[PDB]
Amino acid sequence: SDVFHLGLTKNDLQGAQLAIVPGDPERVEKIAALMDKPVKLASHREFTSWRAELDGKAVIVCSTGIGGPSTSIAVEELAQLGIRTFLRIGTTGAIQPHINVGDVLVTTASVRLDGASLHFAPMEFPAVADFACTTALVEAAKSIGATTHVGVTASSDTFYPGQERYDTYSGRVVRRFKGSMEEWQAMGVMNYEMESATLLTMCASQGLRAGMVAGVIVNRTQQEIPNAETMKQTESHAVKIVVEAARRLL
Amino acid sequence: SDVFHLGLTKNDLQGAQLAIVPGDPERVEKIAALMDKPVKLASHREFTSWRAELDGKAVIVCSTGIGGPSTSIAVEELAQLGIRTFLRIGTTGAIQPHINVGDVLVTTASVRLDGASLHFAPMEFPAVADFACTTALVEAAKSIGATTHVGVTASSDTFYPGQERYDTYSGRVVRRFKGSMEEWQAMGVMNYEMESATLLTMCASQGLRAGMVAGVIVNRTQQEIPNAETMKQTESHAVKIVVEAARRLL
Amino acid sequence: SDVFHLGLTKNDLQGAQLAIVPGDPERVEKIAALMDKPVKLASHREFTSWRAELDGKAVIVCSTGIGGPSTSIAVEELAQLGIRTFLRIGTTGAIQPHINVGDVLVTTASVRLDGASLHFAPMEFPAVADFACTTALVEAAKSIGATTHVGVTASSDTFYPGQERYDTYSGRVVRRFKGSMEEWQAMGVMNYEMESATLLTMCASQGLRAGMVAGVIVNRTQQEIPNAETMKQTESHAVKIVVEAARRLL
Amino acid sequence: SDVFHLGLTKNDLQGAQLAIVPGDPERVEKIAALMDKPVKLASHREFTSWRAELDGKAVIVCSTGIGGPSTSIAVEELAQLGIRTFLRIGTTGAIQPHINVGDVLVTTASVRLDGASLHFAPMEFPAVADFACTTALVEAAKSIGATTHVGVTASSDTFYPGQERYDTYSGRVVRRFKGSMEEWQAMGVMNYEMESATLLTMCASQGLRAGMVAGVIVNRTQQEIPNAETMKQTESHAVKIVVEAARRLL
Amino acid sequence: SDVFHLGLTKNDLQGAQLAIVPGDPERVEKIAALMDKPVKLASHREFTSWRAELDGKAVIVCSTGIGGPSTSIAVEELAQLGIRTFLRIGTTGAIQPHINVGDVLVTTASVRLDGASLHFAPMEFPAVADFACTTALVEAAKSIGATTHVGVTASSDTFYPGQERYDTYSGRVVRRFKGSMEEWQAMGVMNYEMESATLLTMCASQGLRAGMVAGVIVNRTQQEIPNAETMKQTESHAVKIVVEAARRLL
Amino acid sequence: SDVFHLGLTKNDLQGAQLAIVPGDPERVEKIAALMDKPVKLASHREFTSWRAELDGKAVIVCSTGIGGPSTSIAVEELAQLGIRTFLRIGTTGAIQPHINVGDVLVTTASVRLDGASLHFAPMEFPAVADFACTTALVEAAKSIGATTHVGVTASSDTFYPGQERYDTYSGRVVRRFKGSMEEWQAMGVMNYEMESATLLTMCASQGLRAGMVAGVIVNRTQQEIPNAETMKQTESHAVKIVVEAARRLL
C-alpha cells in the first residue's frame, strides 16, 4: 500500500536498502532463516516477502516466480520503496562438460534472449552485473570451498519450448531457435536460467546494483544423474554464499 | 500427477475440456463458486486448480500467474491433460477516454509487446482470438447487460515500462516506448495487460480455441478513480460474463 | 462421525494443524468471515465449529465456552483430529489503570486460578505461552498499529468473586480472593479472563503449541463508559491480530 | 440489558423465584412445555432463557452450559434478578451395582472435586442441597412411580483425568486423582457429574435453595448393553419429577 | 557501604540499569572481561561485583551464591540501587535424552519447586520471564548459531536430597520427589537448576525484567559427564550470549 | 578429591565428629583461633574449612553460606565426611522489645519458613534441636556469664520479605506475610535468622545432633540509637560461647 503487488509500506523495511530475491517462496523463509530476526513481512500474489537482520542491519528476502515480466515488477516495486541492490540466488543446470554438480556459477553478464529486458534498454546495451556485487559473491564462495565459476548465462523466455529442447507434446522450437543450446555451448556460456537478463538489464539501465549466484544441481550433457541429498545440500551452499556476501555489500 | 506443476492426473478433470483461466490464483475459488458443486482439485504454488460442474458439464478453473512464461507453463500442461479451449478473465486499465470503470472489454487480437509468444510463432502471425470464443463472450455479455466495447489490446511484457508509466522510480521510458501509449490511443487499441500476447498466439497456432474478456479497474487518462465496490463490479460483472460465456460454449 | 461433542471428522479439517478459539460461539462466524475459503461446519453444544483458508492452508476456527472445564473438551476434541497449535482470542477486563479499552493485550503466562488445569499438571508447573505463538501475535499486533502490552494475566474459574465484583446478590468475597485484585495490580498483572489457565497449562504439559491474545472491553479502576462498537470493535483488533498472527504460524 | 451475559430484564421474570437450569437449550425447551404459557425470552452463549408458569405463578427455565464456571454466571445473574430457589436436573451414569439404567438419584451433598466452589467457601464447607428443595424432590419421584435414590454425588471438574478413565490424547491424571473412583465407591457415592458441587455451594453459602435430581442413562459398572428405549424414557420421567417437584417448591 | 549486603553504593554504578547476575564469583570475571574497561567494585560474602561498559553505557555483573535465597539478596539490593533489568547465566544438565552436552537453553518460565520464591507472589503466579529478555537471548544464541533450545526448566532447593539423586545418605527424597525426572520429563522439561525459579518469580511480580539462560555441562540424563576443555566452551558460548543479549536489552 | 563444594577428605579431619558452622567464611579464621592448633584446610566458594583441636579431640569449622540450600550442601557433605554433630553460631535480629542488641539467643526449635527441609521431613515433623546440644549451649552461655535468652526462631528462605521488611524496592510484602511479624512477636518467637531450619530439621531426621545460638545484631521493633562500640563484642561472646559450648559435647 504505497506500491502495489507486494503490499508493503516504506515503513515495512525498517530503513532497509537491499533485497536478496530468489524465485520461489520456499526459499524465502529458508534464506531469511540463515539470519536473525526474520519477521515474515507479507505475501501478496506471487510476491511473498520477509525481512531480517544481518550484522545489526536491514536486509529483505523477496521472491520473483517465473518470468522476467513477473520479476521486473517486484524489483521496481521494491526499489521504489528503498532497496537499491538486488542480490539474486538460485540453482540450475549447466551446459559445460568441465562444470560439475556441486560447483556454483556466478553470472558476470547475460545473453539477452528474454524479451522483457527490451523495455528498459535497446539490445545493444548489455545485461551487465555490478562489479562489487560480483566480487562480494566470489569472495563468499572463495571462502567456503565451493569450486567457483564465472561467466555468462543465457536468459531465455521459456522452459520447455524456449530453452533449446525437443521433449514435449508437439516436438519443435521456434525457427530462429531450433538448435540454440549447441551454439551457446561454443561461446563459453555456463548455465540456462530465465530472469537474469531482465534483472541485470533493468538495474544496469536504471542506476541500480545487482549480482547473481546460482548452484549447479545437474549437468544435462553428462551420464551420471544427480542425487537427492547432493541437491538438498548443494542448494544450501548457494544459500550461504550470497547470505554471507551481502554483509560486505551493506 | 502426470504434469510438472499443475500437479493433476488426466483423470482429475473427469471430462473437463474447457477452462476459465485468471492470473491471480485467489480468484480461482471466487470463480469456481459460481458453477455447481465445485471442488479444489489441488493448488500448488501460483497454480491453483479448482473444478466445478456447470450444466452437468465438468468445467475447470486455473491460475496463470503473472507473465507470459508462467502462462506458457499452465496452458501447455492444461492442454496436455485434456483441455482444448480456454477463457481468460481479468482486470485492467483502459486508455481510451470514452471507456468506463466497471465495463467489459473483449479482445479479438493483441499487439505483441512481449517475447514469450515468439517461441510459438513469428511476429508476422497475429495474436488473434477465436470466433467461437468471441461469439459467446460478446453475446453472454450483451446478455447480462454490460456497457460492452470490443476490439484490440496491447499485451505488455512489463507493468511499468512497456505500458509507459512515469509515476515510477526513475521516470524514464526507453526511446522505444517513449510515446507508445499516446500513439496506441489512436490506433483504436483499448487497453493494457500482460498475458494475452502469449495466450492468443500459442493457442491460435496449436489447434486450441480461446478468447478473452476483462473489466476496467481504472481509466488512467482519467484521474477520479473507481472505488472499492467499483472493484467488486468486475468481480461479478466480468466474472459472470466469463461463466455466462463458458456456458454457451459448452 | 469422528468425535462426539464436535461432530467433525478428519476431512472437515482438510488436514490442518492450527486453530483459533473464541469462547463465545457467536464470534466464530466473524473470525472466518475475514479469511478466504470461509465455510460453516456445524453447531453442536457451544462448539460452533467453522473452517477457512489462510494463504492456501487449512485453518479451523472453533469455540470453547465459559470456563476451562468445557475448553478441556474443545482443545483435545480438536487436537485429536490433528491440531498442534491454538491461539485463543477473547474478551477481558483490565486491572492496570493505564491499559485502555480497546488496547490489545497479549499474554506470557496466566496465573492459575482455575481447576481443570490442575488435572494436567501441578501448581508448581507454569501455565506458559509458547514462545512460538507469543512472538507471532506481538509482531502482527505490532505490524498493524494495535496498541499492545504483553504481560501477566489472571485466569479465574469464576467471573464475579474470583475477579472481585461486589455489584451482586450478596456483595461479599470469600477470604481468599479478598483484596487480591489490589495485590495483582501491585504485582503488575494485566487483566482478568477465564480460559487461558487451562489451555496454556494443558498444551505445554502435552507438547502442543499454544498462545493467547484478547481485547480490552472493560477497565474498572477508571471512569469512562463503554462506547458503541468498541465492545465488538474493541475485538476487531484482537480478532484481526489473532489472524495476522495466524498466517505467520502457517 | 439488566444483566450483562443473559440479557434478561427484571421485567422478564415477573415475580418468579424458581428456575430449572439444565445443560443445553434443547432440554430447556422440553421442560418449559409442561407448565403454562411457556414464552421465550433470549439466547446468548450457552444460556437460553424460557419463561413458563405453574398454578398462577411465574417460573424460569435457563440453560447453564458445561462446567462449574459456566453455571457460576447462570445463577448469580438469575439470582440477581429475583430468583432465590434453584433446581438442577440432567443425566448421568452410576457407579453402584445396586442402580439400574432407569433410576433417579438425588444429591444431598457432593464431594467437591471442582475449582469454582473455592471461590465461594473453603473446602471445609459442605456442598449440601437445601432441605425443602431436597424433600420436594424425594417426594415427586415416589409419586410418578419411580425408584428414587438419595445420597452423595461426585462433582468432578473434568472427565477422565478424574474418573479412572483413559483413552484420548492421554491427559495426565493428577497424582492426587490416583485410585479415585474405587475410593469414591467405598465411600458410598452414587454417580458422577460436573456442576453440582459448584451450584449447591454458591447457594448455601449465600442464602439460596438449590436441589438436584437426575436419571441414569448409563451404568458403566457393568458391560450389559444399554437400550435407547430407556434413554428417551428416563429423560422425560426425570424432567417430569423436577417440574412436578418445582410445583411444590414454588 | 550503601547496601547492607552487596556493598556497592549508588555512586559505584554510574547510572547503570542492567546487570548480568551469574552464580559463581569467577564467571563474573569471565563476563566483565568482555565489556569496556572492566573494574572490580566489591567482594563481600558470596557477592563479588564488577562494573563494565557496553556499546557506550555502564553495566554491572554480580555473583549470587548457591540457591535462590542467596540470589534474593543480590537481586533486591541491586534493583534498589538502580538495576532494572537482570540476566542470569549458569550451567546444568538435561532431563530430555535429546538435549546434548553442547546445547544451550532459554527458559520461558520454570516449574516452581523451590521455596524462597514464595515470599513474593502466591503459588499460582508463574515463573514466567520478561518477553524481551527472553527474545534477546534467543537472538544472541542465534546471532552465533548454537544448538539452541527453549522452554521450561525445573528448579528445586536441593542437589542430592532432591533433584532425583538416589545417591546420598538416605538414597531418596520425601513423598514428592520419587521418580519425578521421569515425570517432568514426560511433561517436557529441559533442565534442573536452583536459582532460576526464585529469580523469575520474584522479578515478574515486582516490575523488573529478567532473563534465564544456561548451558548443559553434564548430560546427566545419559550416562555422562564431560572434560575440562568443553567445560570452558560451554561458558564462552553462554558468556558471549547473555552479553550479546544484554547489549540489545541495553 | 572426595566431595566437591567443600573439598576435604577423611584423614583431613583427625576423627573430628562434631563441627562448628558459622555461615560467613570471613569469620572462620577468628573461631578456629579460639580452640587449639588452628590449621587452615580449604577455601572454595564460602565453604572455608579450618581444622582445630580441643582437649585432645578434633573439632572443625566450615561456614555454610546464606540460605538453606547452601547449608544443605555443606552439612550433607561434612556428614559424609564423618561429622555427626553440628553447632551453628551466627547473628540475628530479635522481634521483642525486651531483648537488647548484644543479647544471646539459644534455639530449641524454629519456624519452618524455609523450603529445603521439606526434602528431609514433612512439615508436620518439627524443626527442633538436640537436647544435649541445647543444654550445652545455654549453660556455657551462663558460664562466661553472658545474658542469655532461650526460645524459638523463625527461619526465612528470603531476607527481605520473609521477615516483613517493607523498606525494599517495591515496598511490597506478599499476603502470606503481610503483618507476619506481629503474629510471631505475639506468638512468643524471639529472632529472625535464615539457616536454623534446614539445619535442625535435616539433622533431627537422620540421627545427628545439632544446635543454634545467635547474638542480637539488630532488634527490629527497637530503636534507641545503637551505641557504636556495641556490635562487634556482640558477635564476640556468642563465639566464645559456642567454642566453650562445644567443649561439653565432645
Curated annotation (Swiss-Prot), chains A, B, C, D, E, F:
Which PROSITE patterns does the entry mention? PNP_UDP_1
Q: List the disulfide bonds.
A: none
Q: Which UniProt keywords apply?
A: Cytoplasm, Glycosyltransferase, Transferase
Q: Which Pfam families match?
A: PNP_UDP_1
**Superkingdom, taxonomy of origin:** Bacteria
Give the enzyme's EC designation.
Answer: 2.4.2.3
- Which GO cellular component terms are attached? cytosol
Pathway assignment: Pyrimidine metabolism; UMP biosynthesis via salvage pathway; uracil from uridine (phosphorylase route): step 1/1
**Catalyses which reaction(s):** uridine + phosphate = alpha-D-ribose 1-phosphate + uracil
Database matches in InterPro entries = Nucleoside_phosphorylase_CS (IPR018016), Nucleoside_phosphorylase_d (IPR000845), Nucleoside_phosphorylase_sf (IPR035994), Uridine_phosphorylase (IPR010058)
One Gene Ontology term of the biological-process aspect is: UMP salvage
Q: CDD domains, from UniProt?
A: UP_EcUdp-like
Q: Where in the cell is it found?
A: Cytoplasm
The molecular function terms of the Gene Ontology recorded here are: uridine phosphorylase activity
Q: List the SUPFAM superfamilies hit by this protein, alphabetically.
A: Purine and uridine phosphorylases (SSF53167)
Family designation: Belongs to the PNP/UDP phosphorylase family.
**Function recorded in the entry:** Catalyzes the reversible phosphorylytic cleavage of uridine to uracil and ribose-1-phosphate.
Q: How does it assemble?
A: Homohexamer.
Q: What is this protein called?
A: Uridine phosphorylase
